[PDB]
């Protein structure tokens, strides 16, 4: 309460210029100060669920030794659009760990669906999120159907706040054992799809890991990240967007701009 939005930032003008809605939740893990704008509204996850998917696989690997090393062979029928890594290993297979890295770092859709199957589908990932205390997250469908981003549809959504809270538990808290926690961080740090989103607001000499999402309709796209500014405690944040019309385009620049405002609102000296 008293540490939320100590310093107001012009999020309303930003979303109005964008032509839609922006949801932001950012937490300074040192002081607990927060920046919050539409933070409890639902937004479509799009590919951003794939970070939590990888975390769920890591959690399972704590009880199933050798899970990560398991080789997975798949057929051409598994190769749904935008599977840039798994298409290169169709004739060989990939390990569970490699599928998880591809899902996180390249948003690989075939990899994501293969890992969802390992967990028992969308309900199995939802169950993992419930097990860490997230009552907001819901995954309902598979790739690519989960990208429909229909206004008012709660399927395949979460809130910026719940995304940030869960991300903090998994990357900095105790939801994963220490080796698995660092592996999750390392996968997020190696993401290749986020250079124009939260990372564009983060100075080059700070460490950062992130996971993006882009639905392709309804101006719907997002990013969440852990950021390690030097000399102070890490920041966790989530930035989600949507817009009213199916053919409204998303904007990476708006996500970066919202992240800049969040860091400014937390008093973190950055760019």
UniProtKB/Swiss-Prot annotation:
A biological process term (GO) from this entry: beta-lactam antibiotic catabolic process
SUPFAM superfamilies in the record: beta-lactamase/transpeptidase-like
Regulation: Not inhibited by EDTA, inhibited by clavulanic acid and tazobactam. Inhibited by cyclic boronates, including vaborbactam and bicyclic analogs of taniborbactam.
EC code(s) of this entry: 3.5.2.6
Binding sites annotated in the UniProt record for a beta-lactam: 47, 50, 82, 107, 109, 212, 214
GO MF: beta-lactamase activity
Catalytic reactions of this protein: a beta-lactam + H2O = a substituted beta-amino acid
Class in the EC hierarchy, top level: hydrolase
Effect upon mutating residue 156 to N: Reduces thermal stability of protein
Sorted UniProt keywords: Antibiotic resistance, Hydrolase, Plasmid, Signal
Active site: 47 (nucleophile), 145 (proton acceptor)
InterPro entries: Beta-lactam/transpept-like, Beta-lactam_cat, Beta-lactam_class-A
The family this protein is said to belong to: Belongs to the class-A beta-lactamase family.
Free-text function comment from the UniProt entry: Class A beta-lactamase which confers resistance to the beta-lactam antibiotics, including penicillins, cephalosporins and carbapenems. Acts via hydrolysis of the beta-lactam ring. Has penicillin-, cephalosporin- and carbapenem-hydrolyzing activities.
NCBIfam families found in the cross-reference section: bla_class_A (NF033103), blaKPC (NF012141), classA_carba (NF000538)
Note from the entry: Initially two different KPC beta-lactamases were identified from two different Klebsiella (KPC-1 and KPC-2); they were later shown to be identical.
Protein name: Carbapenem-hydrolyzing beta-lactamase KPC-2
Primary gene name: KPC-2
């Amino acid at each position: 309460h008293m540490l939320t939005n100590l310093v107001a930032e012009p999020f309303a003008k930003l979303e109005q210029d964008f032509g839609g809605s922006i949801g932001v939740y950012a937490m300074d893990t040192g002081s607990g100060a927060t920046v919050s704008y539409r933070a409890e509204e639902r937004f479509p996850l799009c590919s951003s669920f794939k970070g939590f998917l990888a975390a769920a696989v890591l959690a399972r690997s704590q009880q199933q030794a050798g899970l990560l090393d398991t080789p997975i062979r798949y057929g051409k029928n598994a190769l749904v659009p935008w599977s840039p890594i798994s298409e290169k290993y169709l004739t060989t297979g990939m390990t569970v760990a490699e599928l998880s890295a591809a899902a996180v770092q390249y948003s690989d859709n075939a990899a994501a669906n293969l890992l969802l199957k390992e967990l028992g589908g969308p309900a199995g990932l939802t169950a993992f999120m419930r097990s860490i205390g997230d009552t907001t997250f819901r995954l309902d469908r598979w790739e690519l159907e989960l990208n429909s981003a229909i206004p008012g549809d709660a399927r395949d959504t979460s809130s910026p706040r719940a995304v940030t809270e869960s991300l903090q538990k998994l990357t900095l808290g105790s939801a994963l054992a220490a080796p698995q926690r660092q592996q999750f961080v390392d996968w997020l740090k190696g993401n290749t799809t986020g250079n124009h989103r939260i990372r564009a607001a983060v100075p080059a000499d700070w460490a950062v890991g992130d996971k993006t999402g882009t639905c392709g309709v309804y101006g719907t796209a997002n990013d969440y990240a852990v950021v390690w500014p030097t000399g102070r405690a890490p920041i966790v944040l989530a930035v989600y967007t949507r817009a009213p019309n199916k053919d409204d385009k998303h904007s990476e620049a708006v996500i970066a701009a919202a992240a800049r405002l969040a860091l400014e609102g937390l008093g973190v000296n950055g760019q």
